[PDB]
């Protein structure tokens, strides 16, 4: 309608709205760098812009509806509550500043309200970098276009913007929205394990996932796209469920989890109906769950002693690593000992045993009875040699 | 914890919930298998609430009143017992999870010194799973660890005699059980901020800390008290100022050259007057916090030079007039006095911690206005103390503190006006 | 074919569990009679036939000798091949194997759910045969309705359209009944149902929902005195008769004819009889404010949907409710004061802008030497929305007057004198 200029208002609140948010205190606080992001892609200098234009305008219009069925009729005729605010046409001037600063002061935190949804975890640079995909921006115009997918609700205050990844230095996410994906598909885990026996699980949950709306707008996306995507979302799915203080520790365990996903795509023998599916978004989390203990005990492993990455690294170039079976734990537990083997007692008599009693616990699960559920012979050649 | 992470997830939120107990929040899931995995984390908590609702009302950190841990949890209790807050009745799943911690961490921490010696193996709270935390239980792993350890002998002559290796237990125990834990940090500890608006006191120190702050120059003071006369320009400058500190709160910048050239017309801010900017040309962003006292006392004291009514949000705890003897002490304080620094503070002291409802649990209407003054100004060690505030009457009260400023804003005015 | 039938035998044989020797024996008997049927078979519209004959004849025993959930229950996962296209007429008797008859309590639908243990397959199965058997029958579905309101959550609290629509309130989320329930004027037949079934009331916190939101408007008040007996044992009911009255009102558009005047004429004077049939136990436990945000809504709709400035009567009605709802309120406190000021204020804003909006561009014209309204009502519309009796501390005795005197004297005193002894006035 032709009764307000919308955009120009919102143009107008982002400052005031971005203003109200805070961070979780630490995490390099992105308020100078959501204004210029939001004032940036607020305009309509492409198709791009409007499109962020047409569906901001529509988050507005159904909160703002949410917020005024609730308001009394009184104060839902806006204008005559507005002539009779002595103080408000007193401190605005004009009698159009008024009416203009009111509707300022309602939408204000209704936009700080929903910036606080779609920038958590560095979302907002998927839209604003240059040439990113078109994947990217159509998963994140999509996930944002749906109200009942991404649910926003309402709150001269602070809205906590709440950080999920912690991630390292500006390494913002890699999909558009990872928290509501990984949600997502944890309630459907929980569902299709409340539903189907441990036996059809996978399938239950790889099939529930291609029938919802997520599901079906990523089966569009040619392959090309769709290995871009898993790959992005076992990287952002690390991150949300794990903590690596490096970034080559993040992709040994990226590494260790596809191949935990490419072992499981490997363990039925000829379905041929589900691997119709392969390079679908359950599948991390089908990964995750069925090698927990191990990428947990890498991820310990990793942590206690870290100078055994460099070791991997040179064992990578040695094996061109991280195939379709789950070994990093094994080499790992290896490259450990025979760090403890080539040192014998040299930083102290002392220090040695220190090592030693630290790695105990972890090399001690990883040549375990019940640790290799089920392996090829190479993963239980190098428990061999660890044991 | 996963219960805990689940709801502030879900409730991140003030004064909203709808529920009355936590049957009534299970029981409000269409899903069936999420209402399961609900009951059995909240089953979890409630066993593991009343076997430790005792050691939390003595040995906890956590103090806690004693109507949270008389009673026995059952799923009829209130829906706020399982919310992580810090304030009231959800103080008791962060009591749970702190006093879980200190028992993981207090074990750990004997084990290090016992013969680790030292230990940087620490991670998250945020971030805990089954492989982090002391785990065993007493059939399956410490009973059969025990009586691998008692140890019979028959002497010649003729007796059974058990004997414990205690060394041998505290071994094997320290061994599967306590060693290779980390040590959990309280970081990531799932909460709810329980809070809309914290106040400006704070937001000041941030900007103090990431930024230089001085005062304003006497020519900026000049300029724009000129520029802004207008009560609706005066309005816009503090709503400018007020976004600007907001935003600096969060980061900083250069104290020398203001940010109007390079963000504050490039940036897209493209609204503001003309006058509010030309008031804004002759400062800098190490007179942010002088700005915003300078325009909050200045838009206060023309809502007092045009009669009307000018602090209408403060309660009436603090509004009453002086009486007679009263206001010739403060007379004659204000003969001898710095007024343009002395209400600017007083100004800043009334709009800050001064707020109307629930003030005299901190702020007593029976002190004296000097007192609190100085206690106040030395809160942040502020160079303006120094002047004629050690002349003030000691004997003027909190409850007259409005008129006092009232009274010295209409001298400033009254001088200023009759003399040009 | 007989490929299904392994499947049929399996999924059966789950059935088995959670129940007691019910549907296996019945797995069994089902076997025997497609051996029975194997002399000289056809081809796969013989087998499905002679199945859904042997589950015809087993449910004839079940209605004629006997007279069963779970044979019902079983025969909606038999016909989920949709076999019975000419056995159409069985859809009067599946209905019957599913009315819970003798299934008086909500603790019985406890007792009765595991043989329907997971809430979402058969919940399909149900809602497919509520739109299935929705054709020029359509009598005995209703019957159904306790069943997959067993099958979904509990009932919402919160008011009309603030958080739910039609399909949320009633329960139905399938149904298309919007369309259903505004046609020509046959189907009073659902409420002659909702005569005779009335004791599944005490099962649902839904039916009586759903029950006022299949009803057309005009047969809605009879069953709205049929309700006085249910009512009578929950007196908190009144608010979802306001909510379902306030949900079909805006669906309809301007009221124009005489007989959908008297329908809501009769729904509002209906809506009275129950509010001062009882108490302000209709505001038990603290439910004033619902009501009275409801009955607001519900002015506000109504006031929209009248313009023929003849109807005054409607929101006539909706505002001598807001009185008797105000008048039976229990006072307490300082609330309540606030409250009744408020509801009164807002009552008289949409009479006020209703009024100002059907009377326009003048008041009395003349055109002839024969001055006259040319709102032919217009005094009949004022002495009723004026002589209705709000409190007289509040307003609606200036307000109103004054706006009547404010068109009074947009007239010349020539004519405003000539009117006022031309026998109309």
Redesign the interface.
Known sequence: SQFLDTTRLV??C???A???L??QNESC?R??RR??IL?DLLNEDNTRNASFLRESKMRLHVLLNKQEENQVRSLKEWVTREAANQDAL????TFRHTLWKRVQDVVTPILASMIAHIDRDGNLELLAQPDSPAWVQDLWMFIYSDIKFLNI?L????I?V?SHM?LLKDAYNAVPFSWRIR?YLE?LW??????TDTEGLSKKFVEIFQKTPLGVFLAQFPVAQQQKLLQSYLKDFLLL???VSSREELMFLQMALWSCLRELQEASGTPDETYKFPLSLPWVHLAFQHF??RL??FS?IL??HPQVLSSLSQAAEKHSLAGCEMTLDAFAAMACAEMLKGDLLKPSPKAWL?LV??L???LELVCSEGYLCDSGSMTRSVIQEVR | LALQRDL??QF???SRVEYSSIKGFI??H?????R??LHDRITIFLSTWNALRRSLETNGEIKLPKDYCCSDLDLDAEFEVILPRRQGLGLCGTALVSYLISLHNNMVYTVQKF???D?S?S??I??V?D?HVISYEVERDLNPLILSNCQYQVQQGGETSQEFDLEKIQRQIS?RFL??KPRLTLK?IPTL?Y????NYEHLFMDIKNKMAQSSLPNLAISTISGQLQS??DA?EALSIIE?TL??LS??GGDPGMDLNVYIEEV?????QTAQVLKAFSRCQLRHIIALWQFLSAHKSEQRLRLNKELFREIDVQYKEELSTQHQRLLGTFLNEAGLDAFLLELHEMIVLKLKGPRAANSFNPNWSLKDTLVSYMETKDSDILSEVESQFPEEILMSSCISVWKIAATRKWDRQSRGG | XXXXXXXXXXXXXXXXXXXXXXXXXXXXXXXXXXXXXXXXXXXXXXXXXXXXXXXXXXXXXXXXXXXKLTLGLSILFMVEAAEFTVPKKDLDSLCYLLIPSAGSPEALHSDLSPVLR??QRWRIYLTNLCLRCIDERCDRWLGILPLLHTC???SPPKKNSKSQPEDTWAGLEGISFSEFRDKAPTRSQPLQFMQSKMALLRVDEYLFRSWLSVVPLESLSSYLENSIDYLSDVPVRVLDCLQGISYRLPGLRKISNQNMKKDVENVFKMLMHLVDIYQHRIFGENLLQIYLTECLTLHETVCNITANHQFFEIPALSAELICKLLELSPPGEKSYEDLVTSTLQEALATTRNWLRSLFKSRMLSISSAYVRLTYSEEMAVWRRLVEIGFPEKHGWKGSLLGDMEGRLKQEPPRLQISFFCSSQC
């Open positions: 143009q107008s982002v400052q005031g971005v203003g109200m805070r961070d606080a308020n100078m204004v210029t004032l007193q401190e605005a001037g609700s709150v001269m205050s602070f906590l709440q912690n949600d309630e929980v569902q299709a394990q409340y539903i469920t794990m903590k927990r203990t947990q005990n310990r942590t206690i220190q009693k630290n105990s616990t972890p | 502030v997830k991140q939120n003030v029981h409000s269409s899903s069936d298998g999420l399961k995995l013969s680790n010696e230990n193996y991670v998250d945020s971030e799973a492989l061994s060693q290779g990531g901020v809070r809309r608006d914290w009560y609706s309005c976004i907001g935003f969060t980061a940036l897209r801010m493209c609204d | 997971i809430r979904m959550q509990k």
